[PDB]
Amino acid sequence: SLHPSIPCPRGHGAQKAALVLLSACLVTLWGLGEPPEHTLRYLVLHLASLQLGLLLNGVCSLAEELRHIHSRYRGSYWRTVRACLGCPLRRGALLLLSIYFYYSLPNAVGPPFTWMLALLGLSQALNILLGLKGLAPAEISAVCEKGNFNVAHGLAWSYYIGYLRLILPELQARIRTYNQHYNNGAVSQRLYILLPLDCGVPDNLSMADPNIRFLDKLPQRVYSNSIYELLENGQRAGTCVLEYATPLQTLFAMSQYSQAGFSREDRLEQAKLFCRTLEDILADAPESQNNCRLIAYQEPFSLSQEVLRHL
Amino acid sequence: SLHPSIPCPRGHGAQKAALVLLSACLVTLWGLGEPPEHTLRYLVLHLASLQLGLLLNGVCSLAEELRHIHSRYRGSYWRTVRACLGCPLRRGALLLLSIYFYYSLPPFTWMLALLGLSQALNILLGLKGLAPAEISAVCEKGNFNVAHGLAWSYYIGYLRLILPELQARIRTYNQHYNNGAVSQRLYILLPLDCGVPDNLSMADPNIRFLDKLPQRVYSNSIYELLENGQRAGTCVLEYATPLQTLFAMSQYSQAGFSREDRLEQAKLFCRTLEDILADAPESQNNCRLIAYQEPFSLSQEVLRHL
Amino acid sequence: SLHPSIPCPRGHGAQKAALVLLSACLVTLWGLGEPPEHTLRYLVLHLASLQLGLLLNGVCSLAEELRHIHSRYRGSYWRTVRACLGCPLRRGALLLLSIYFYYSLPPFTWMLALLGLSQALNILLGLKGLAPAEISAVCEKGNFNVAHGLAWSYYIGYLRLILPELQARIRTYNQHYNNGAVSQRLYILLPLDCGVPDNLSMADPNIRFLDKLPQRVYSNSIYELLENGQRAGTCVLEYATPLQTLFAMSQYSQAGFSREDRLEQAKLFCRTLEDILADAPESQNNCRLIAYQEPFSLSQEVLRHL
Amino acid sequence: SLHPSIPCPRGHGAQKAALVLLSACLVTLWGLGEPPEHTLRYLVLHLASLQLGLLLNGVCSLAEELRHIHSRYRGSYWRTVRACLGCPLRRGALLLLSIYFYYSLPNAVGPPFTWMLALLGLSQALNILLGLKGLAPAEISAVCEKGNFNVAHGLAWSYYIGYLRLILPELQARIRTYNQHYNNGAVSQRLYILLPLDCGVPDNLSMADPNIRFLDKLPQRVYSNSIYELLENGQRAGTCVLEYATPLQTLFAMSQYSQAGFSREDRLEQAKLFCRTLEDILADAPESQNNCRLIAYQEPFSLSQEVLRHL
Amino acid sequence: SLHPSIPCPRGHGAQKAALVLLSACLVTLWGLGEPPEHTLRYLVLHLASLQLGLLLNGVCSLAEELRHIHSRYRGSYWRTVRACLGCPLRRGALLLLSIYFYYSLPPFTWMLALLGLSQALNILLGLKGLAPAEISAVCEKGNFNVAHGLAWSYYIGYLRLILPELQARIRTYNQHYNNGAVSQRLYILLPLDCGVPDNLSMADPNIRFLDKLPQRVYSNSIYELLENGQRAGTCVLEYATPLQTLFAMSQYSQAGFSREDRLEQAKLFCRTLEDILADAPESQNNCRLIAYQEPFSLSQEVLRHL
Ligand SMILES: CCn1nc(C)cc1C(=O)Nc1nc2cc(C(N)=O)cc(OC)c2n1C/C=C/Cn1c(NC(=O)c2cc(C)nn2CC)nc2cc(C(N)=O)cc(OCCCN3CCOCC3)c21
Ligand SMILES: CCn1nc(C)cc1C(=O)Nc1nc2cc(C(N)=O)cc(OC)c2n1C/C=C/Cn1c(NC(=O)c2cc(C)nn2CC)nc2cc(C(N)=O)cc(OCCCN3CCOCC3)c21
Ligand SMILES: CC1(C)C(=O)N(Cc2c(F)cccc2Cl)c2cc(C(=O)NCc3c(F)cc(F)cc3F)ccc21
């Protein structure tokens, strides 16, 4: 909600679509009136074949993982087996069910047991070699945003743990001291962290818009926060402690280099994700309680207008 | 390499396994000896079913992304369809070819309904789950890991700004004071357990603080290294704060960052910091990384690198 | 009564629902008018199958606790069997009667093997899930809560030691001072959001710190109760520290305790603390519990109870 | 590990036994060689009946949870439905599967759809009213321990957050200062916390055993901690900051009161669980960086011997 | 956008031309409707002949690089074979498959000898020469250009080191100058004709040299911009010395750098310099590129950008 261009967390729309598709398929099956015994047997055989294919792919992965057991898996074999096949005992039970219900049940549509196993191994080898069973970017994004497999996650958490959680307490006291000592307008008691989505972070904040102009270094493990006054049609509508977000600058510098594999599309994606994650952390932090305000913006507009409307 | 516990980049053992499995499958198919027209039809049907399942999964993902199209994909349907279904042209051609072969190769709509029901059950319950090893491999290949971002930010923000002047400051200190020669390399420690005391001396009594390097300010601390009570050497010891941040991430509940994930990302962070510092112009053998896993004397490990 | 958003203890709505379901079942069996012998035979068979499934689940539980027998049950097999199978004599008699009826009522070993397989599948995959509402009801009934312990500790540890002396010290401060006299009741605030600032001024500027009560010392404070900028009274304001403890528990990842559970336990803590203080011999209406949920004027809410 | 009587966390042995039983059942089925389609159909129908019974139980639970919607569920029906029927879409899909399979598949042993529904409703009503489906205490304890549904966990976390986390940092400095002043042996730099499993906590630690005697009050929120010395055959072999665990005292007081429903067997179980939870928290917490040691004991034995052996 | 004569990056017009050609071929095949077996056999034979010709060309290339194996490829035969034969596995499989079709489809040795002779004549006389358009496309695809190196060196050596301090020096001179403030940007001139005078006075009398910026001895210059004989502003004009380097390169005979190539590389240099400066962190709109070619008024062109 910081900016309309920042994505929201993934919902359960896929589950709802799956439920609707299941209902439609059930309605079609009831309408056609085909025998249900064949339907159940074929569905069980299909699921058994899928489980056996997953087993074969997991074994193929285990073949390479066995050389990583000493380093990535603390020298334990059951850990590697679980990482290759998911839950060990549940998958084993599913495999036993597959074996029992394929070696016994009739197979009108499907190969015989050992011939089916050979053909399925051939198909799995073809999938591994040619990469047919790949992951579309939607699934990769969902996995990344579910298990927190990102770089924006790391950058935002580092920003909170290292810088914000350290200056948020003393910020109010220092602002109050500056207001009391110097009787020359008023200063808002919240640091406004700017979040340029396009990751364009100049070293000089005043160059973003001439209205934002530096006024004074806020008096004081040595944090220097330059305060800026906001000119509205040439008149100072107020002043505030304003600064950029350095993780966005590090994201941009990551995109510049060639040892990152981090392109402009990925840079913008991570900028949006970092802004959202920092919003979450600051919303649910004890230090950030009417203390700091995030101002996310994408240049298509003047910065002073948004800073003032948030003021 | 950096440490025996640090996982080396993934090898091609999966390709060797695929080759072995392909050889075994060819051997057994030749042994059984059945006409290949039936095999071809069955395999084409299998790929057709797999492609139809992928299409249904993409349809569900499209229904999910209908509410994120305007923000994630700049409000363009082409990007959303490509994200949910892979490459548009390639996947579309593959699905069309599979459908044509499926219709040509000898119930017609009943099979489609059964396949749709099976895919809906797979998506809802989650039978075809992604194994943790596959997820880790994909994330590492695509640089979708937290440690990569943390290490790159560490290099860009702190290392790149102090390494050029570290040698100059060390030389100034050496020409300003003597015995006691400080090493010209920043010995960055990488404790894989991620338990970092706020002071080196607290972590190990064999390590003593000596002085502070001359200096935004960048204060560095030169430490005394002890052995049997005698000073063996002095180096600019400095913990890698990204590991402390990983530990704090694992502490909080909002991160969803488990201890096993913490150790794995510590290993990845050390490895990618090695990779970054290997080719970094600012790194000219003036910064040596030390990785140690307590099952230990830290001072002995530091000296072994001297 | 304490707050509209605090859940009252569960009544017997499930009993009414069961009665309605039983009445509907009687109505529908009367409507069909099926012979009762077959109905009874099938009901007994279903109950025997459920008993056998419970027996197999208890066998699996006993296999699990065979290694815990030394600690959980002090090396006693009888207690282990009772824990894994409920009442020993009653469950044993019920299982024996069910087996006898199943043998008498008209495959036998095939059905037993299939029932064992079904129970193994239920235990492995986890089809027989537990409803979260049922889990919450069981926890509330059997005191398997966290807020229960939190509130009992807060009452026993702190309230029980200050409530007798709070009125005496309030009176001492009243006679020491002059005319609005401080209220002789403790207005313990209970912010259900669990976000407690260290100072009341930060929570609400209209509330101001005024003085400290005279004294193993409890430094209870006396605050200015400003309405429209004028002091309408004086009393002792004191946050509930178990709320801060629950907040810190929700913050950490080593608690298995989420924000939804945090609000749930704040509700339960307020409810059971009020229940304890209602019957507390030390409490003689000398401490008034004030609770609120932020959607708010704190000073006006406090003045309402004044 | 602290004491042989403290129960270890539940392992996956239950699933191991389940897999063993499944293998035995599969072997038995293969030996009998009954028509596999009959077995699969019967299993599907049994699972459908179980799902329908769970649906009826969830509906009955909702019938009482709906009156708590305004307070316990923040006034939302979706929350109540989710809390009564588990995951909404997954449970709905399972229910639709059960309905479709029962309405279509033949059943040699099984009532017709409406008559089966009536009989299952009667059985569910009987189970609810009479409590026939009695939850054995072992599974109740397993669920409570898995989901942190025990007062011991809350008391341990409160003990850590309120008291230990505020004194453990400065404890080392205070002990070092006291050692600097009074050179009259040396005091251990680790706080020892006594855990009486019998929940018998006297007000004075000295009266617990003659060999333990209070020496001096450690100089400093008043965190006055009394140091105690150990009389090994009349000699002060060691001295340390020793005190009881007040959560165990509160547990004993709870057991004394009749308004807690907190019996003696439950008191012992909760004492053990509190000890183990505090062990875990101190093991992983940063403040307890080899700063505190827990001495858990149960009187069937001298306390001083255990304290010395831990020293 | 920098200049009308600056070429845009190569598009995909050839893809559209191929689409039109394919459409015409499909239309004529549908119109004629000749049997497809002969068409397939002829096309397969033609493709196999093309593959065999490429194989023979690669064999000759390998015979050439048998002496460069130890210099260009560090003494590894596999890299040399890949260089002379494209992707090893893909092209090897293509050649094997083409051979398999060629043998399967029905003299044979005479055809192979004739194909070898045709390849020998193609290589010796260079019939399959690379048109300059294809060479330019490959160079712009793989970034094989003199302009690329020149612009990258200009950015990394000069612009990246003077863009930051230029604005500070300009601000100092602005709060040092009594009388029109100088612009805060570097107005780099990019004369596409590459005829650069040693001074701006010779370029146009309407532009006057005024002063030297305070100072690495970069020592930029500030000029007077005369409009109608009166000063309209002052900017830090500064030629692009890589253009002079390109001109001097074209002058000499050892460069192999004709005037056409000189103009092409000047245009490419300007385009890639703009591309680099667009994403350059040091560029904060403090350096405005100016390009101009006489079919001209330099002073008016500079005033337009103000
Ligand atoms: C960013 C690189 N990085 N990635 C990861 C992962 C870890 C690190 C890392 O190690 N950084 C770091 N370590 C230092 C140690 C010393 C020293 N003397 O030892 C000196 C340094 O440079 C001053 C140090 N720096 C760089 C600057 C750091 C701290 N800092 C930040 N941080 C971030 O923005 C940020 C981005 C991301 C992502 N995560 N974070 C949080 C860390 N913003 C600041 C704004 C102001 C201002 N407005 O004035 C002043 C600051 O510094 C004053 C505090 C100095 N204290 C710091 C700790 O205690 C000793 C010295 C600010
Ligand atoms: C809270 C953590 N925790 N969870 C469980 C379970 C057990 C404990 C625990 O161990 N607590 C504890 N033990 C101590 C021992 C010493 C010592 N020197 O030995 C010193 C301490 O700190 C001063 C001790 N503390 C913390 C302070 C505690 C008592 N106290 C509380 N109570 C709670 O908040 C609370 C929350 C929940 C839930 N349950 N409770 C009841 C305990 N509110 C207070 C408000 C004031 C004020 N502003 O006026 C002053 C207080 O105490 C001043 C000194 C009184 N003391 C002196 C020593 O004897 C005991 C009494 C207050
Ligand atoms: C839903 C439905 C009816 C369906 O559409 N298919 C696709 C399909 C084929 F794959 C193959 C042939 C026909 C159809 Cl029609 C399917 C498959 C099975 C099954 O058991 N496949 C086992 C199996 C193979 F068939 C080939 C193989 F190489 C390995 C393997 F392990 C069950 C039900 C279905």
Ligand SMILES: CC1(C)C(=O)N(Cc2c(F)cccc2Cl)c2cc(C(=O)NCc3c(F)cc(F)cc3F)ccc21
């Ligand atoms: C696994 C297997 C073979 C099994 O062991 N039983 C136990 C059992 C009975 F319950 C009932 C009779 C015999 C057996 Cl033998 C079972 C039941 C069904 C079934 O459909 N039960 C519907 C159903 C009822 F019959 C009575 C009722 F009150 C509600 C109800 F919902 C399917 C498969 C099995």
